[PDB]
């Protein structure tokens, strides 16, 4: 079934714009959505097929206090995305309240696309955590979608924000987003501003314009995470299939990222694999261990080599895995696209469930716990107090996220077979 | 020669320890798939991943080891043997007779490399530490490191330059078969593999060396986790070593690249004159 | 070879054979399994071939399969099997790809028969995996509305772990078939065929690709014993499909009434806690015996694949036991 | 067996900067760390392998009150060394105290590299004894490393300070460094400023800019001491094997240096060996005797000749040593690298355990003993007094180094079987 992407908030809209543009050039599409004359791919899932042959994306664009939504409109690609579905604070509470009054018109825009498509498998949100308007509005829309579509699944390309710690309420906003995300999202793929900023400092000298350049980094991961679906293959020919192996237990659904040629700008499979397990290739910042690992490779890969490449990674014992029941590294192969450069003829990505990401969640919980005692930034803005007089959703969120922090470390232990 | 005469030791440093934890186990308890994957991996890891025929090496076992040669349960450094694959074209020069002996050369040369690093490992653990050990370990190490500088730089690279030279100036394939068997018999005989009693005295020296490192490492582990047990072993081991070291030089002085061994083993006149035989 | 390559296109028929009769496209098959569930689950003794043909037509239009030469797209046809007694459409349904003309000499009556055995196997373990993904669709799609109830999680957790362990075994075997029976065999066939000159090297070689798949898969008369044990796993998967649902429509049933019990308020639910506290032990022991039975079969299966040839059994055994969860006395 | 080098202090940072640069040109590496297009070596131990062949040295650069760490950064080779691991008095006590507050972040930088590498054979330290900041910080870091990594062996290419005797506390600083170095260092390679300055006066007219030119001399020895490791050879690939033979007794862990063509800018093996045993080729400034010796060669060397050459020095007896042991000498032949000049087609050095180096240790102990009585420079700086009110570590150091001075001369005697 076709995937509908609910890109929301200024930050989320910017990564969402970069992702559709990335699949514009990668696929046979021009800036006016017209089939390219120069042009073997499954474009049905991501791109609606129009009567003018415009490959309109199934993308929902939500604007709040719009500034970067106006810049998106003055672009050569304005015609490419024309489902004609764009509808008009820095606080999580401020975003949640604004979303509630306009919920029905934004929700009808969701319906239109659902009716238009032959079918709708899942919702993929370019969400921004502690995103000012992006968070709060995104949590609320996350709660409505599951109730209306119980059968359908929700994924979130959360750009978890770590900038070395401006938002003084950033921990409070993030705390609330996760509670909704832990109980109302089937999958989540985690990214980190600092981890990518550190990569940007590593691969390039770019430091001050970190947000503009890092977009491209987020994009390469986001196009890549879907390439097995966007191009046909013998296995993983549906979104849920990739999502099943990566998230074993319903509560623990946060996925780490990595890319072998971060500098993609021959290499044997045996090599692109080990390069990935190394921690410079990772883009995320008591014993600790992965729960299950998966990898996808797109290039000139001897199909025969992968049958022995898995054994090669097994001998180096580079990775420590889960201890209760069985789990294993999974090897997958896809086709690099023609037209665009074939540099780094072999180039890979990995999506993995790792207990280290618990540490990033605890750091915002640490900032919040410190901030909660001080009550330095309760906002006490009438919106904040009137929306939350008890201020007990933050405590409800604190216990829910602490259960998650606990559940992760329980995973490390030998008895997750017992309740965790 | 890259895998049989150990010119590429880069590969051996990486391969040795990566398989050793398995090698220390005895036979019938060792899985050829595990060793095969480990060598297959080590070969990719080494800087020697540029040779076209690298795939040929295969891990096989030598039954009875040097005993079959004119315990079997013992394995690891003990039962390791490489084997190389050749098709009909060049099989006619590099054959069973040729590769039975290249392997038999590599095997003896493996122990000298393996037990030199076991003596090196016991010296790392020690880094109050009575010197009883430091006297005997300095004796064995300076004796062996010198056997391996004689074997690799007094016999092998010498004769191999004879083979590469004469195979450049043959004009027939019954004369190339002459040089190939000529180089191989020369390196086998000039080296101590060719002795009437086959230098079992060298084997007895290597048995006391391994027994020394075993207990010495075990004791240093035991004391961490005093001389009535340690210095007792130190004195007896040093006394048996000095006896066999002198027996080796004495039974090698009877022969007359002949004395370049003993003249070197006592370089700067150490133990050069101790006891004149008879 | 120049006039059979163009006028009769032996090249395009063997190229698209992998794609459609060996599930090489996959997309087409997953779309086909999606639309063709209700008729196949229904006893097909009432079903007939015309309905299957018509659904396949629109199914081809749905997938990128329609973007191909019309001739190969037309040759494919649904084939009924013997109408097995007391059966469901799932047990008796296989594509044929009827072929006639000069291309017949390369693809003979012996060739289409051996492909149908491959298809009989691949349909079973392409469904059984799409059944376990429905299971995980359900476990994810039922727990998201039971976030209020704290009493259930315990039996719910025991159902999730066994479901996860099952997905580890079938999903990995799916990869072993993907890259160690249908990628290395096809690579071997292609190079030996496209470098050939005598048409006699294309026949006696193409049969080798065929007679190597039947031995790297378990369809040979000798690997049949290991398939017989594999059937038990292919049984225990749908066994959980009946163990899982029978609990929710019973457990979830009380929750709907609890909303209606409070909608009455807007002592009966103390007797519902009574049926809960007596139902937890029986469900617990039933699921426990299921996990032990599954462990007892999968461990005997892994110890069943001891070396006979080792050409294709060592690279699956490693895959099923990676991380040494098994062979460490489980 | 990847080996990390902990280059520390301004003087130590100067010789690590050059040593890595020397292996940049010698190996196939450019100033940006990129594989050279013009380019058979074992670059694995010394150089980390990045995905796009950016072979980055595993250098740990420690700075303190930085000035020349800034000049290292403004260089064409700044990109070549980018593990992105550089972290911000003339007294030994002043250096030791500064190191203690920052010990955990500098130690995490050690951990990162240890985790990143497949394995860690050893650590290499570049520093000057009485190096102001370099000493004291270097002694403290020497003590932490052995406790954390007992297996790991730390080797310091010590820049022992001999300038004809400005630092008025130089003997006190050096005295303390050796006590740590005698009990907490697995091996030490000794070099001398005066010995090299005398060589500089001999080979060249350079006198006033002694430090800049002598850097090249220390480098040629440093690159050379590792060449058996950096290029595969029949024996001496591992660092442990290379050193163990040189030091027979743990305590006597100090090695002497020499180079046959000091003016490397044909020659038979018989010649290059005799030349080395002569004392002009040596770079270090009652009977006395080398404990054990061993020769290193890299050039167009015939293989039949070295044995005749070994036998020649046996008859020449140019260098004399008489340990009660049979330590004798060892031989080594290695490949000179292509690309760089092949001048002095046969070029080599010698490492020699010698009891003469005891005399250099006693001379600083002599300056210190004279200085201790006067108490002319007790510093009495509050850092010095507060850190050391008893001033008894200097006396603890004096007995430990005197034991070392005694042990050496005991080695000369016929009975080092009995305690020396
Ligand atoms: N990855 C990425 N994140 C961004 C970018 N711009 C902003 N952000 C993130 O967006 C968050 C704040 O959202 P904001 O832009 O204030 O939303 P607004 O309230 O609609 O302006 C911060 O946590 C930033 O890390 C970008 O270009 N890339
Ligand atoms: N070999 C060598 N030694 C140097 C050089 N520069 C300084 N030194 C030595 O460094 C020691 C003093 O260290 P110093 O430079 O004071 O370290 P600082 O405290 O960081 O300035 C003296 O003993 C000098 O011999 C150099 O370029 N080469």
From Swiss-Prot, chains A, D:
Record-level Gene Ontology MF annotations: GTP binding; identical protein binding; microtubule nucleator activity; structural constituent of cytoskeleton
Entries under PANTHER family matching the protein: TUBULIN
The species this protein was found in: Homo sapiens
Positions carrying Phosphoserine: 119
Membership in a protein family: Belongs to the tubulin family.
The organism's place on the tree of life at top rank: Eukaryota
GO biological process terms, semicolon-separated: cytoplasmic microtubule organization; meiotic spindle organization; microtubule cytoskeleton organization; microtubule nucleation; mitotic cell cycle; mitotic sister chromatid segregation; mitotic spindle organization
Record CDD domains: gamma_tubulin (cd02188)
Database matches in InterPro entries: Gamma_tubulin, Tub_FtsZ_C, Tubulin, Tubulin/FtsZ-like_C, Tubulin/FtsZ_2-layer-sand-dom, Tubulin/FtsZ_GTPase_sf, Tubulin_C, Tubulin_CS
Quaternary structure and interacting proteins, as annotated: Component of the gamma-tubulin ring complex (gTuRC) consisting of TUBGCP2, TUBGCP3, TUBGCP4, TUBGCP5 and TUBGCP6 and gamma-tubulin TUBG1 or TUBG2. TUBGCP2, TUBGCP3, TUBGCP4, TUBGCP5 and TUBGCP6 assemble in a 5:5:2:1:1 stoichiometry; each is associated with a gamma-tubulin, thereby arranging 14 gamma-tubulins in a helical manner. Gamma-tubulin at the first position is blocked by TUBGCP3 at the last position, allowing 13 protafilaments to grow into a microtubule.
Intracellular or extracellular location(s): Cytoplasm, Cytoskeleton, Microtubule organizing center, Centrosome; Cytoplasm, Cytoskeleton, Spindle
Positions that bind GTP: 130-136
Protein name: Tubulin gamma-1 chain
Curated annotation (Swiss-Prot), chain B:
One GO BP annotation of this record: protein-containing complex assembly
Tissue distribution of the protein: Ubiquitously expressed.
Coiled-coil spans in chain: none
Localization in the cell: Cytoplasm, Cytoskeleton, Microtubule organizing center, Centrosome
Domain of life: Eukaryota
GO molecular function, one term: gamma-tubulin binding
Purpose: Component of the gamma-tubulin ring complex (gTuRC) which mediates microtubule nucleation. The gTuRC regulates the minus-end nucleation of alpha-beta tubulin heterodimers that grow into microtubule protafilaments, a critical step in centrosome duplication and spindle formation. Plays a role in neuronal migration.
Family under the similarity heading: Belongs to the TUBGCP family.
Pathology noted in the entry: Cortical dysplasia, complex, with other brain malformations 15: An autosomal recessive disorder characterized by global developmental delay, variably impaired intellectual development, speech delay, facial dysmorphism, microcephaly, and varying degrees of cortical malformations including pachygyria, thin corpus callosum and subcortical band heterotopia. Most patients have generalized seizures.
Quaternary structure and partners: Component of the gamma-tubulin ring complex (gTuRC) consisting of TUBGCP2, TUBGCP3, TUBGCP4, TUBGCP5 and TUBGCP6 and gamma-tubulin TUBG1 or TUBG2. TUBGCP2, TUBGCP3, TUBGCP4, TUBGCP5 and TUBGCP6 assemble in a 5:5:2:1:1 stoichiometry; each is associated with a gamma-tubulin, thereby arranging 14 gamma-tubulins in a helical manner. Gamma-tubulin at the first position is blocked by TUBGCP3 at the last position, allowing 13 protafilaments to grow into a microtubule.
Protein name per UniProt: Gamma-tubulin complex component 2
Gene: TUBGCP2
From Swiss-Prot, chain C:
Organism domain of life: Eukaryota
Subcellular location: Cytoplasm, Cytoskeleton, Microtubule organizing center, Centrosome
Tissue specificity field: Ubiquitously expressed.
Signal peptide: none
Family the UniProt entry places it in: Belongs to the TUBGCP family.
Functional summary from the UniProt entry: Component of the gamma-tubulin ring complex (gTuRC) which mediates microtubule nucleation. The gTuRC regulates the minus-end nucleation of alpha-beta tubulin heterodimers that grow into microtubule protafilaments, a critical step in centrosome duplication and spindle formation.
Quaternary context: Component of the gamma-tubulin ring complex (gTuRC) consisting of TUBGCP2, TUBGCP3, TUBGCP4, TUBGCP5 and TUBGCP6 and gamma-tubulin TUBG1 or TUBG2. TUBGCP2, TUBGCP3, TUBGCP4, TUBGCP5 and TUBGCP6 assemble in a 5:5:2:1:1 stoichiometry; each is associated with a gamma-tubulin, thereby arranging 14 gamma-tubulins in a helical manner. Gamma-tubulin at the first position is blocked by TUBGCP3 at the last position, allowing 13 protafilaments to grow into a microtubule.
Protein name: Gamma-tubulin complex component 3
Originating organism: Homo sapiens
Full-protein interval shown: 546 to 890 of 907
